[PDB]
Design a protein around this ligand. Structure first.
Ligand SMILES: C[S@@+](CC[C@H](N)C(=O)[O-])C[C@H]1O[C@@H](n2cnc3c(N)ncnc32)[C@H](O)[C@@H]1O
Ligand SMILES: C[S@@+](CC[C@H](N)C(=O)[O-])C[C@H]1O[C@@H](n2cnc3c(N)ncnc32)[C@H](O)[C@@H]1O
Ligand SMILES: [Zn+2]
Ligand SMILES: [Zn+2]
Ligand SMILES: [Zn+2]
Ligand SMILES: [Zn+2]
Lengths: 345, 345
């Protein structure tokens, strides 16, 4: 709030205004402000940004000035004009060329999640997702609602690959996976995690398993290399590729316990002695009261998917019931953690 | 982000997730969580909250647990159950009975502003408001779009009165207004600021001026006391009530310079020597690069109204052109500041 107001009032305003700060970041990403600034020979003024993003003078200045206050951009003065430049933050996470780019996820959060979240009170009220109430699109089959169009499936796929450029190494190296020569990424999407897995484990080979529409899009928009293979199908009913390790990264959180149990059971019966299951999810503290970002993510699963985020013990009951033993989890200090369980005799 | 990740990545996530934190606060307000907790004989468990707000168990727990992490609620343990209670923050700003309640504004930000803000990129792109693109409602006359229904006009009116319970005293006491026995609050709405003005200045009398629909709603939903009068009309063309002081609180920011100049001109020609104009707005720093909340508010005017937030110098050019002299402003340390100018001979 105001600089002299009581701390509780300032906090309440921070929370109330949060949606505005999210949209400033999302719109700056959608307009390509950071890309234009990274492609420029040096820093740019309002009129040069407004012209490059094809937007209004007043609108651009408001946007750039808010970005400076938020520490997403730096400003400098030359003559009778402000000149904007990228920060370490925006160069690393907000430019398309950066390997650690978070662009596509931000644009996705802005275009889909933000819309869904307006219906939060009803998702809480009813205990169910709101794709029909938000997009008019039936969600009886979760992913036909999520991939409501070709361009929307490419965007989802581009969005999801982005976290692995920052979190990939932590999760794949939490446990020594060199022990599993043949791997399968169930619901592997574009294959970003698999690409990382193969550079990390030179001996290993991996199959990316996903629905026919994702596999086709992955091959059409992402190039590959000699360690990675693709199998298309439905993990709830099709035969799974033979593997020593099955990886489930952000798959279990999309579904309720019963659906999770079914998939875990199929994987278990497909595994051989010494076989493993690597579950990659954001772990909830045992009291379900943190971390805050994970709690928000669990609420985002209520609003969007059929699932929730879970505690280590919850993933343990699920994996133990499916038949797995030697349950171990590793808290990475990152958004995504790793769980590994094995099949015995 | 994750507790061990780089500070820039944690900051980017804070910003990206802001919309979720806003909606948690808005939905907790819409569900009446804080009221139910204040009306209870003591602290309540998940099942008692879920039943009282008529919502799902999973949804309620997620909501309450996020509120605890956000410091909006406190939790305690008794037997095999968590018990939630209000904080100083929620009791003072989030309960309907509290005089400093911010409820109605939060519900309004959630229901209208949040929706509008999804169209931020286009409001920036085009340099205009999005009522037609968001609500289907024509905005050619700003307030017919803002008061699109009776219940929506009552909500807007209830929302706007709330800031004056906290910021009212600062703005009205920045300058000694005892010098102006007769006052007029132009666009005074429900008359919250006028009610405060009259307790602060016992000698003074005030007329609340607003559009016929607002005046009728104000008399029908708010009771009055012997110092306050109501005149209905259009400040752009109707005769203004006779007054020594004209107050413009959050009126100028809704409009562009030309519309502001027109209204200021009418007020000037209505004033007599020694007459005053009290402008109450959130002042932008001279470089237009802060405060952050004011910059967000200026962007909210681009997205919603026909105006912007302005710098002291900008309000000075406007007031000076209309004919006013002795321009003075006072930065309160709060969201809203005060500007006073006078009419000479
Ligand atoms: C939330 S995405 C996670 C993708 C990826 N593992 C990551 O973390 O970036 C869940 C993935 O599961 C895939 N999926 C959903 N249902 C499936 C099914 N029945 N059979 C195969 N793949 C499925 C989706 O198409 C999607 O790529
Ligand atoms: C943004 S509200 C501010 C209300 C109040 N002064 C406050 O700060 O809480 C602007 C007020 O101006 C009123 N208004 C808009 N156009 C008007 C007009 N042409 N004549 C009279 N009142 C008008 C609106 O109905 C509304 O109550
Ligand atoms: Zn079995
Ligand atoms: Zn168990
Ligand atoms: Zn004149
Ligand atoms: Zn001037």
């Amino acid at each position: 709030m105001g600089s002299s107001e009581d701390q509780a009032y300032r906090l309440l305003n921070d929370y109330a205004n949060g949606f505005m700060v999210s949209q400033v970041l999302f719109a700056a990403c959608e307009l390509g402000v950071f890309d234009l600034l990274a492609e420029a020979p040096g820093p740019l003024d309002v009129a040069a940004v407004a012209a490059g993003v094809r937007a209004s003078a007043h609108g651009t200045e408001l946007l750039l000035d808010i970005c400076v206050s938020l520490k997403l951009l730096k400003v400098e003065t030359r003559g009778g004009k402000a000149f904007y430049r990228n920060t370490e933050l925006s160069s690393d996470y907000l430019t398309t060329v950066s390997p650690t780019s978070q662009c596509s996820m931000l644009k996705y959060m802005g275009r889909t999640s933000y819309r869904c979240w307006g219906h939060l009170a009803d998702a809480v009220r009813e205990g169910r997702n709101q794709y029909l109430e938000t997009f008019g699109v039936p969600a009886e089959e979760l992913f036909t609602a999520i991939y409501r169009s070709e361009g929307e499936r490419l965007q989802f796929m581009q969005a999801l690959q982005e976290v692995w450029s920052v979190n990939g190494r932590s999760v794949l190296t939490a446990f020594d996976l060199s022990v599993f020569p043949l791997m399968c990424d169930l619901g592997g999407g574009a294959g970003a995690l698999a690409k990382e897995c193969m550079s990390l484990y030179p001996g290993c080979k991996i199959t990316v398993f996903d629905i026919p529409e994702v596999v086709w899009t992955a091959k059409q928009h992402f190039s590959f290399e000699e360690q990675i293979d693709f199998q298309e199908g439905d993990f709830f009913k099709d035969p799974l590729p033979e593997a020593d390790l099955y990886i489930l990264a952000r798959v279990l959180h999309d579904w309720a316990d019963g659906k999770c149990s079914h998939l875990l059971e199929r994987i278990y019966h497909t595994c051989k002695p010494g076989g493993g299951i690597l579950v990659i999810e954001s772990l909830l503290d045992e009291d379900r009261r943190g971390p805050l970002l994970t709690q928000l993510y669990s609420l985002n699963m209520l609003v969007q998917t059929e699932g929730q985020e879970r505690t280590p013990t919850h993933y343990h009951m699920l994996l133990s019931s499916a038949g797995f033993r030697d349950f171990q989890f590793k808290k990475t200090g990152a958004i995504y953690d790793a769980i590994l369980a094995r099949k015995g005799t």
